[PDB]
Design a protein around this ligand. Structure first.
Ligand SMILES: Nc1ncnc2c1ncn2[C@@H]1O[C@H](COP(=O)(O)OP(=O)(O)O)[C@@H](O)[C@H]1O
Ligand SMILES: O=C(O)C1=C[C@@H](OP(=O)(O)O)[C@@H](O)[C@H](O)C1
Length: 168
């Protein structure tokens, strides 16, 4: 099972922190979005565009569940994976690091030309707020560790490592 599962909104630092945390723990990084792409042979964007969000979530849930069983490193979940009840259920018992970000910094971090089905213009800020407001309690319910990332990646990682190692 994963040493740590990373959850957070897009732009919260999953890929950055994941790479750095993985390195620090001497383990591999798996991103569930990449495994979805690997397994389906299809882009995340095409599944959304053609098949729709709900089929995406079921695929995503299956991939999350397998990864929770087969991956021994740091696992990062796509931002909406916690909207699925069965994903939250499967996360029970795991080490789950919620990377928290404010709207304004998250907006700022997600601004370039990455294709994002649920966060395209115009009005990305509005859309970011709606995703944050809706998902905050969902991230909170699965998290075993809340990490404010609004700090330096290196710092965030030292904090995570520390908190993985010692009693509450
Ligand atoms: N702890 C942090 N503080 C400030 N900026 C960060 C931090 N972690 C990541 N970033 C920045 O946020 C952007 C997106 O980070 P990323 O790791 O791709 O988030 P996610 O993978 O959750 O979408 C990048 O520009 C990255 O440099
Ligand atoms: O917010 C979401 O629901 C999504 C976030 C993406 O993952 P990241 O959070 O890694 O960008 C990806 O799974 C898809 O576009 C849906």
């Amino acid at each position: 099972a994963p040493k740590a599962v990373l959850v957070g909104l897009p732009g919260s630092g999953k890929s950055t922190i994941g790479r750095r945390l993985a390195k620090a723990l001497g383990v591999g990084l798996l991103d569930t979005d990449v495994a979805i792409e690997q397994r389906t042979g299809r882009s995340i964007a095409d599944i959304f565009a053609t098949d729709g969000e709900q089929e995406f979530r079921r695929i995503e849930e299956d991939v999350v569940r397998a990864a929770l069983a087969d991956h021994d490193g740091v696992l990062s979940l796509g931002g909406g994976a916690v909207t699925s009840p069965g994903v939250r259920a499967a996360l029970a018992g795991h080490t789950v690091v919620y990377l928290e970000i404010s709207a304004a910094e998250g907006v700022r971090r997600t601004g370039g030309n990455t294709v994002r089905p649920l966060l395209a213009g115009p009005d990305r800020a509005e859309k970011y707020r709606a995703l944050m407001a809706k998902r905050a309690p969902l991230y909170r319910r699965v998290a075993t560790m809340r990490v404010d990332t609004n700090r330096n990646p290196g710092a965030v990682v030292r904090h995570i490592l520390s908190r993985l190692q010692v009693p509450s």
